[PDB]
Ligand binder design. Structure first.
Ligand code: MG
Ligand code: MG
Ligand code: MG
Ligand code: MG
Ligand code: MG
Ligand code: MG
Ligand code: MG
Ligand code: MG
Ligand code: MG
Ligand code: MG
Ligand code: MG
Ligand code: MG
Ligand code: MG
Lengths: 206, 98, 79, 114, 127, 151, 101
RNA sequence: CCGGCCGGGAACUCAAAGGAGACUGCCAGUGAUAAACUGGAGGAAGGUGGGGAUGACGUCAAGUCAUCAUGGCCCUUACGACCAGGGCUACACACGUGCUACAAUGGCGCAUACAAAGAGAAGCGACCUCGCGAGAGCAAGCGGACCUCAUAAAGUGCGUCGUAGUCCGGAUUGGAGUCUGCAACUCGACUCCAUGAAGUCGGAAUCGCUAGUAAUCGUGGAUCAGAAUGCCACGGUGAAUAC
RNA sequence: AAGAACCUUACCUGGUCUUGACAUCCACGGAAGUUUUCAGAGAUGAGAAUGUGCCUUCGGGAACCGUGAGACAGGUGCUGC
């Protein structure tokens, strides 16, 4: 490892922050911790609903969670009762109250987190890493993306040694700051150990 | 009389927080002293980037904090109540002063 | 050289010393409070200060009053 | 230029020439010179005898020279007698104020040779 | 009337008001003689007055804050060169072909991480 | 450098009597960056020289610098293997500066008392060229001439 | 970072909340220069040990809330340097972009 | 009551936004009439202006399984757990990295000038009082460009010191203390008094650095109850040299 | 290691605990808590008074607390080859 984190290096310019809430120098830390809490929990629960990202905004001493995901229906459920349940159990630890807003994305194959977790979910099921990785790249590029590169690393295939293999297509400039690049790493626990599946998606020139 | 002071993190988020807190006041009751810039508080952090050893390599982060004064040299009634229940603009903290 | 207002002692040792002297001379007292100063009223008792793995008895004399207990219980042995 | 136990300097300002007396440094020397009314700029050679005695009566009030010596000998020795940690260090020729012994401590431990 | 000039050599930011009149150079009430007129480079404030004579032609109401002695002085020089605009480019022909007007930034470098003071490497050791 | 054909920096002329040449001298005396003290010493040394010589300063520091100033010096320039000394004429610009450097370097020894005293004396001995710096110049000449067979 | 240690830490925190910043008066008040300089203050420096060895804030090592790492701490965030960076690069902590002056 | 202290002013500094500006663009010459180059002009800035961030494919089966996650394996009345005390601070020695030195471009005493960057509420703590001092008491203001930490230090003027291991050096130790903290013995920091070591510029050897850099001078932060000569950061003074 | 007096602490000596300091499951009893006392280095052991709330299937509740049984918990244990 020697490369800077794609998202951090652009946090000010193109990319936004996931957490959006000014805080005093005091309740800043604690609030941040409650945040980490609701994030890890919410993710650990709505994992089956294929969540891409969450935006934790905090207006007027009241917390507001946003959930960008590919399947808003599974998240809400019938009538939106799951929404309520989640407002209860999640609002509880966030300090309350918590109005949540699900956000649909009709292009799931372009979200780095989604592609990552997809390849991963394929990797747990013994499927060949090359077929999965290349499948993801293929579907991405033909779905409409200026660039994408995926990268798997670990025992992959049950080898005695670990060997990193990355497959790319299109133009993906990591140094061009004006460039909008999606990025997400996701551990893929297997029978032989963890297999990292980090993916970059150059979405646009700006 | 109305000493409003509002601070945030992202500078161009408070630009419209101030433009909007001044419009929804200056138009219904007039009077304003404008968005007084104030110094930006910049806390810096110099964390070690390596989980173990390698003291030499460090990342240095910062948190720019942009303050803004408003000032309204008259307690206009259409304005003094246009502050409460008419603030919004989350991500930006705003403390009104009497 | 520390604690400008009143000497320091641990209650179990202070009271142990009180009940000891009031009852008369006996045998060395197993105390771990090396941190505690030595009172004048402790003169006579050969209390045994803990060194870390044993207890070294010390017959408190007229001079061992200002010093604390840890002064008279060498720990790290050298050759 | 003979007050107290010794003090035999020459061509020096009164204060530094009184620092030559064991048992008294600078500050205490200024105390002396203010107690004698003598200015602290004049040299002992310029200082008249009638003043020399007034200095003597004043330096007698403070413990100096040999008396101080046997005061320190009494302290360190008493410490070595008690067998306390500080005296224990005194006997072994190692730092007392809890200095790093592993590397430095070359003043107390003595010159590096063996 | 009265002509202003800024100038700000290294950190320090001088302000040089100037008028025609007495040869006294006032600066923050302190006389130019007593502000730093006794120390070295006492005349670096009087430098932009060689090819463009002063003598008794113009009094200077100078102010300064920040920086240090010589830095302040430099800021003053620059501020005067900027203040000499009442006769415009005709003075700048010789005023520039002699330096003076150049801002001359060269601020102190930030300390680099892992180093010791921006350039000084913290002592290499082969073994 | 390997490529940089950079020019020389332009120093500020001396604040007292205008003499960039000896302001250059002051710079080669400025310990710990203290230009003040160093320049004070320079002056003090030049007043006690304007008196003991009768000369001014720009002429006193002159008829003393030329006596410690090198004409030709050595610096090895190997050709195809062997690395023997090759005497070459010193550039005039470096010339006088090198002479001032030897003067100050001598003033660092020859411990009289005050630094100003020492430096003033140094210039004094440079007057009739019998000082340590002129000896330095001599030996620098012995490096050449007697070894000027290489060309 | 050793669940035991985390427990120890939280018990220290809370138990310390129960007493001091409330019963710190035993030394902050009774230990003062006045008439209480008599046997009352002595009774104070006596009673100060009746309390459990903890309760004192000078025994809260103050670890990371996540990993519970005793070192590399930042009181501003409450997180370890490793975790504060690990989060910062994900765009977690607001207004925390890479400094470059 | 000359303190921007008060009216008042928005000029000016500074503050923070939004823009402008530098592109070999213009000019000469050179070069294959090409890229490009050397020079000049104007310009605040000259040719990637300064500095930072940003680290390609991989290399070292480099480092961390003790930050975290995790495959194996292993313990599972114990290799897990609780507590007190001890240790991590031991010292014949060896090395690395620093700080303070060896002095007169210096030490000391008095007077006086000029900073930036910060930090701050179970925090910063003026003022005033007592204490030789560290500090203690009482107690404003301030979550802050207003209040505080907070007198910047070298510098500058004047006086002394005369080249001695000295009015250099300040280690070591003794005594008396203050502060935080349940507790300062093992093993804290600081102050006062006394003490006053090696050291007179360092063998073989070796390192840093091309400018506001090296050098030297102080200040602040994080960690933190207390505990830096370390780390990170800010400003003052400010070179030498590059054939 | 952006700061080992205690803690930190992983190490040592001694005294101790065992479904255990931390998590969920079930049965069983108790509001939780708070004041204070004795033994002990303390952990812990033994008590002494008080308080006895949010819903009634009212053989139960939602927390909290103690013993019971087994799943497990726990490891800064080994391997960065
Ligand atoms: Mg664990
Ligand atoms: Mg602590
Ligand atoms: Mg290896
Ligand atoms: Mg290893
Ligand atoms: Mg322990
Ligand atoms: Mg250690
Ligand atoms: Mg001294
Ligand atoms: Mg000697
Ligand atoms: Mg270079
Ligand atoms: Mg050259
Ligand atoms: Mg310990
Ligand atoms: Mg055991
Ligand atoms: Mg490896």
């Amino acid at each position: 490892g020697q490369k800077v984190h794609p998202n951090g290096i652009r946090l000010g310019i193109v990319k936004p922050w996931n957490s959006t809430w000014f805080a005093n120098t005091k309740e800043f830390a604690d609030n941040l911790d409650s945040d980490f809490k609701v994030r890890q929990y919410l993710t650990k629960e709505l994992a089956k609903a294929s969540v891409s990202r969450i935006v934790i905004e905090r207006p007027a001493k009241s917390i507001r969670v946003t959930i960008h995901t590919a399947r808003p229906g599974i998240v809400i459920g019938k009538k939106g009762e799951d929404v309520e349940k989640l407002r209860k159990v999640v609002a509880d630890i966030a300090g309350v109250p918590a109005q949540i807003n699900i956000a649909e994305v009709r292009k799931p194959e372009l979200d780095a987190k989604l592609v990552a977790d997809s390849i991963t979910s394929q990797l747990e099921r013994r499927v060949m890493f090359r077929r999965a990785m290349k499948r993801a790249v293929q579907n991405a590029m033909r779905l409409g993306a200026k660039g994408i590169k995926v990268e798997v690393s670990g025992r992959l295939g049950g080898a005695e040694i670990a060997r990193t293999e990355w497959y790319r297509e299109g133009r993906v400039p990591l140094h061009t700051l004006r460039a909008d690049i999606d990025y997400n790493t996701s551990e893929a626990h297997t029978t032989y150990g963890v297999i990292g599946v980090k993916v970059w998606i150059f979405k646009g020139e700006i | 009389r109305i000493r409003i002071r509002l601070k945030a993190f992202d500078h161009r988020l408070i630009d419209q927080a101030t433009a909007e807190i001044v419009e929804t006041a200056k138009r219904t009751g007039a009077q304003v002293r404008g968005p007084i810039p104030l110094p930006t508080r910049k806390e810096r952090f110099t964390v070690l980037i390596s989980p173990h050893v390698n003291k030499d390599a460090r990342d240095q982060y910062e948190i720019r904090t942009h303050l803004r004064l408003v000032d309204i040299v008259e307690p206009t009634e259409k304005t003094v109540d246009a502050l409460m229940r008419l603030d919004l603009a989350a991500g930006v903290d705003v403390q009104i002063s009497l | 050289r520390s604690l400008k207002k009143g000497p320091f002692i641990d209650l179990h040792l202070l009271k142990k010393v009180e009940k000891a002297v009031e009852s008369g001379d006996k045998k060395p007292l197993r105390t771990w409070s090396r941190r505690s100063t030595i009172f004048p009223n402790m003169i006579g008792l050969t209390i045994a200060v803990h060194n870390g793995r044993q207890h070294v008895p010390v017959f408190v004399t007229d001079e061992m009053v200002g010093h604390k207990l840890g002064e008279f219980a060498p720990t790290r042995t050298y050759r | 230029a003979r007050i107290a136990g010794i003090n035999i300097p020459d061509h020096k300002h009164a204060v530094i020439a009184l620092t030559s007396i064991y048992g008294v440094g600078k500050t205490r020397s200024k105390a002396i010179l203010a107690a004698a009314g003598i200015a602290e700029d004049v040299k002992i050679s310029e200082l008249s005898e009638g003043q020399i005695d007034t200095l003597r009566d004043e330096v007698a009030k403070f413990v100096v020279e040999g008396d101080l010596r046997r005061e320190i000998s009494m302290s360190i020795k008493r410490l070595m007698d008690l067998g306390c940690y500080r005296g224990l260090r005194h006997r072994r020729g190692l730092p007392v104020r809890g200095q790093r012994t592993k590397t430095n401590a070359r003043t107390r431990k003595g010159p590096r040779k063996p | 009337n009265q002509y202003y000039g800024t100038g700000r050599r290294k950190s320090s930011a001088a302000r040089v008001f100037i008028k025609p009149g007495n040869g006294k150079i006032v600066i923050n009430q302190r006389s130019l003689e007593q502000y730093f007129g006794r120390e070295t480079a006492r005349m670096v404030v009087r430098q932009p007055l060689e090819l463009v004579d002063m003598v008794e032609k113009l009094d200077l109401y100078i102010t300064v804050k920040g920086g240090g002695i010589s830095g302040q002085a430099g800021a003053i020089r620059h501020g005067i060169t900027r203040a000499l605009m009442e006769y415009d480019e005709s003075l700048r022909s010789e005023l520039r072909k002699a330096g003076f007007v150049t801002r001359d930034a060269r601020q102190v470098e930030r300390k680099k991480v892992g180093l010791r003071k921006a350039r000084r490497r913290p002592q290499f050791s082969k073994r | 450098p390997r490529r940089r054909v950079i020019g020389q920096r332009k120093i500020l002329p001396d604040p007292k009597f205008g003499s960039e040449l000896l302001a250059k001298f002051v710079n080669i005396l400025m310990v710990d960056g203290k230009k003040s003290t160093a320049e004070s010493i320079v002056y003090s040394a030049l007043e006690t020289l304007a008196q003991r010589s009768g000369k001014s300063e720009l002429e006193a520091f002159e008829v003393a610098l030329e006596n410690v100033r090198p004409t030709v010096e050595v610096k090895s320039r190997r050709v195809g293997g062997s690395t023997y000394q090759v005497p070459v004429e010193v550039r005039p610009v470096r010339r006088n500066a090198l002479a001032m450097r030897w003067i100050v370097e001598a003033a660092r020894k020859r411990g009289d008392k005050s630094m100003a005293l020492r430096l003033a004396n140094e210039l004094s001995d440079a007057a009739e060229n019998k000082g340590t710096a002129v000896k330095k110049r001599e030996d620098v000449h012995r490096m050449a001439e007697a070894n000027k067979a290489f060309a | 970072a050793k669940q035991s240690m985390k427990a120890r830490e939280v018990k220290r925190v809370a138990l310390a909340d129960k007493y001091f910043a409330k019963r710190a008066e035993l030394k902050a008040i009774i230990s003062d220069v006045n008439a209480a300089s008599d046997e009352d203050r002595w009774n104070a420096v006596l009673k100060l040990q009746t309390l459990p060895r903890d309760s004192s804030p000078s025994r809260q090592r103050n670890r990371c809330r996540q990993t519970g790492r005793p070192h590399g701490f930042l009181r501003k965030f409450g997180l370890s340097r490793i975790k504060v960076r690990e989060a910062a690069m994900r765009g977690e902590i607001p207004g925390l972009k890479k400094a470059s002056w």
